[model samples]
Structures are given as C-alpha cells and as structure tokens.
Target: QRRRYFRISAPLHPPYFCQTKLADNSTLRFRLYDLSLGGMGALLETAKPAELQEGMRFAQIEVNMGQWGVFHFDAQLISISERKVIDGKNETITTPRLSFRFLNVSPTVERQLQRIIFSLEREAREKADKV
Candidate 1:
C-alpha cells in the first residue's frame, strides 16, 4: 500500500522466476509475485535467516520473462513479511515474499516494461473477466 505505482500481478508459468546473488556469493530464486513500472516483488521459501533483510541493494536482479528473455535492473530491498497463505495450513510467523525498489532505470528498461506490463494487464483482465 505504500507503493506509488500500479503493481500488476505477474506470475508466469514454466518456472517463471527471479534470480539474485546473496552477499555470500551464492544465489537464491524467487517466484514472481507482482510487477510494476517502478519495481517488482517475489516469493521465497523460509530457507535462510540472515540471507535477506531490509534496505539491501542489488546491482542487478535478473528475471526471466519466459520467451521474452531476461530483463536486468538494479534493485533495493523494501521489506519481507508474512503473505498469509489462506489454505488448509498456515504459519506461526512466516515471510515468504520480498519486494524491491527499482533504482536508476535506463531507457531500454522503460521500453521493455511498457511492452511487458501492458501484455500482463491484458492477460490479467481477461482472466478476471472469465470468472
């Protein structure tokens, strides 16, 4: 709710994921949660304790846009909190999702997002109208 931009819910198939490096030089993967012209967020498992936190900046985070190839951008960590998965089970205190603020975008990125974000908006609307 703190965001100033519209976030398109952009979960894709065939293992649509985001990849980034930890400070430890290892890598971690996250499922796509939402996307925006400004930034994006993703979901991760509760795997590490000190791996992620607030206010961390990544020089580049790569997201696979399926057949559209990869988009690279700088990102600053916003926060991680419990997503509240409403299902047969729940967690005591969980934080499966994380968000980032886009930093220093390029013209190339702006063009990419206009194409990608519009497509996602159409898809999301059609899917919603179906049900």
Candidate 2:
C-alpha cells in the first residue's frame, strides 16, 4: 500500500499514554510503539491481549502527548500479531503488536498531528547529523 504520511518511531520510553475507548464506554490504556498522522501502533499496557482483536474498532481514542498536548480521533484496529524475542539468557518473550488506522478525523487534528510529526523528524535528523 502507498504511504500517505511519514511515520515516526515512538520514543524508547514514551512520556505519554493512550486511551482507547471500548464499547462499554470504558477505556483501555496502551504504550505507543509508533505514530503517524494517519494512525498509530501501540502495545497494550493495561489490557490483556485477549481483550483486543485484529478487526476491533474504537469510536474514540485519546493520545496524551505530554507537553505536546492531547488529540482525539476515531480509529480502526487493523493488525494484531505476536512478536517473539529471545534475550541473552535464551528466554523467549512474547509481545503483542497492535496497529490502528485513523478514521473520521478532523482537519484540526490532522494539522496538530503534522506538527508533532515535523518536530520528531527534525529531532531525528539532528541526531543523525550528530552521529
């Protein structure tokens, strides 16, 4: 598929938290894996893997980007899979990877998202130059 926007890798330690609204009007929290103007990928921080599925969609999602502020939008669950990693001790770690696609987003939100993306890109370029 053609990429519509630039995607930035989430910080190793994100300063923000994401809340995904559920059908019961409750919310589930997650840690961001990556983000873009189009959508975001997150790892469930407070919910179990069995709680969410590949095709699940949320009516609302709030991503609080610390000093960058918070943004709200609708998102559709696109991909859900497991990632296996082995540490130095040869112990396997199973991680759930979840991805969402933005839906019914507003112009205002898009502009703000662009601003965040631009900032991240600039910072990354600067880091690369330093190296």
Candidate 3:
C-alpha cells in the first residue's frame, strides 16, 4: 500500500497567523499539519484530525514534523464519515474521527507533554510580549 500525507502552514490560527495552544491539560497531541481536509469545521474547531479515533482500538503515534520536537499521543480508530450539505454550499466532506484514551498514559507521561506544551506556549507568548 502507498502512504499519503499533508502539510499545513505555520501560525495556522487566524488573523495574525500564529500558533495556538490547547486551553486544558489533555493527553491529546494534535498538530495542525495532520488536520483533515473538507468539512471538519466543528471537530477541528476544538481539536485536530489526528486527535480523532481511528481503527479498532488501535492507532499510531504521529510525530509532529519531528524536527521541531518529539511529541506523541495515544489514539484509537473509530470511524470515518463525510459532512452533509445542508445550506448554501455542498459541504460533503470525508473525515476520520479518533477517540483518544485519556487514561491511556501514566500520570507522569501526561504531565510531561502538558509541561512541554505549556513551555512552548510560554515561549511564543514571550516572543509576542517582546514585540
């Protein structure tokens, strides 16, 4: 089988084109680069595509660009579906939803990732503060 992938630009947020961080401490590690294409307005609103569950109680730990940093999160395969067009545009979009195991990792591991994200976010904010 052939493997497929995608690439999204940095500062994928909005207005200022800046990276954003999660509000709460969750075990899910989402990279904008792995976000699904099409009608994921709702899901992507709060999380990334990779965060969605996939397969039968099994999923892979995706590395976010690898070069930037080493981060991993546990995920499970659930199902895939497309959006229904109800309004002005035909929003028939296909997507794979991942059901993350919040308690999948040890408490220590979860805290480690959370701290990393917090640190990076702080660094970004500091940079913003400088400007």
lDDT of 3 by residue, 25-87 (tens): 244333232222110111233334343344434323543433346444443434444433355
TM-score of each: 0.82, 0.78, 0.36
* lDDT, residue 92, model 2: 88
Task: For candidate 2, write residues 1-131 as lDDT tens digits.
Answer: 59887689766443457886666666788777778989988876543545577778787588777777777778899997665679789998777777899888788878877877776677667767785
Q: Give the TM-score of candidate 3.
A: 0.36
Model 2 clash pairs are: none
Tell me how far the alpha carbon of residue 56 in candidate 1 is from the true structure, in angstroms, after superposition.
Answer: 1.0
> Which segments of model 3 are wrong by more than 4 Å?
1-30, 33-56, 65-68, 77-103
- Model 3: lDDT equals 0.36
The TM-score-based order of candidates, best leading, equals: 1, 2, 3
Model 1, position 8: C-alpha lDDT score: 87
Each candidate's number of clashing pairs is: 0, 0, 9
Better candidate by lDDT, 1 or 2 = 1
